Amino acid sequence: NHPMLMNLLK
Amino acid sequence: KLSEEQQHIIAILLDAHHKTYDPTYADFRDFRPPVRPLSMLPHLADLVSYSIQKVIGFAKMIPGFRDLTSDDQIVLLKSSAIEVIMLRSNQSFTMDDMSWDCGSQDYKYDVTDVSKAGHTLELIEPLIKFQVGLKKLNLHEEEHVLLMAICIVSPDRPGVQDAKLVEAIQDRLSNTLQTYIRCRHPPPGSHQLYAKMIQKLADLRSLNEEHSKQYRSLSFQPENSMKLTPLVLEVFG
């Protein structure tokens, strides 16, 4: 679960 | 011979790098200030957190990388981040005094600053060796960015699902690098340059292990973990 990393990838 | 596609790849990575590495270091003013027990941990955590963001930006521009799933993207960046930072940091590293010099005294980092962030010679010695060995390859910028990309897109990282795809993306980058060396890197510096560059990736895996073990320690101390950033916590665990 990686909301910030996920968000920087989007 | 460099195909048009190989040249396109190189141009993309050069530009991805120019977009994510600001050689003025102006952003460093916004970090918590360097203080010189773990006096440098707040500043160096900010520095690393900032650079994780740049590395993510660079990764996103690697040809083929956005064909990956989100999970695989995450997994590759989670395992590669610290390594790519070490690699990219070679641009500020100076052998004049084995320090990373980011434009002023305050932002000049030596081995003592690195120990003031909680590391010992367990990391610091292979890290300096690595930086000096890398510096001595005198890589063309084209080789430097290709190596960062190769580092990120490695099929044997823990957590990888579609290893065959990561491997196909990495192959195209390796073949580009092998071919660039042959066509554009004169002897004698080309001499086994590919194999030497790959050795540096093996050295990074080793540094990563050292990083993890020390980070695991530093974590079991919530008072120190409290000084990190939310990004660093999410990426390094």
Ligand SMILES: C=C1/C(=C\C=C2/CCC[C@]3(C)[C@@H]([C@H](C)CC#C[C@@H](O)[C@]45C[C@H]6C[C@H](C[C@H](C6)C4)C5)CC[C@@H]23)C[C@@H](O)C[C@@H]1O
């Ligand atoms: C980071 C870069 C630059 C320098 C890199 C340096 C010099 C300062 C000290 C660093 C950041 C080293 C780092 C302290 C090693 C490490 C580590 C992690 O385990 C650690 C240690 C602390 C606790 C957490 C968060 C961070 C502080 C990083 C995990 C490696 C690369 C070094 C400056 C410029 O070239 C941009 C480049 O991205």
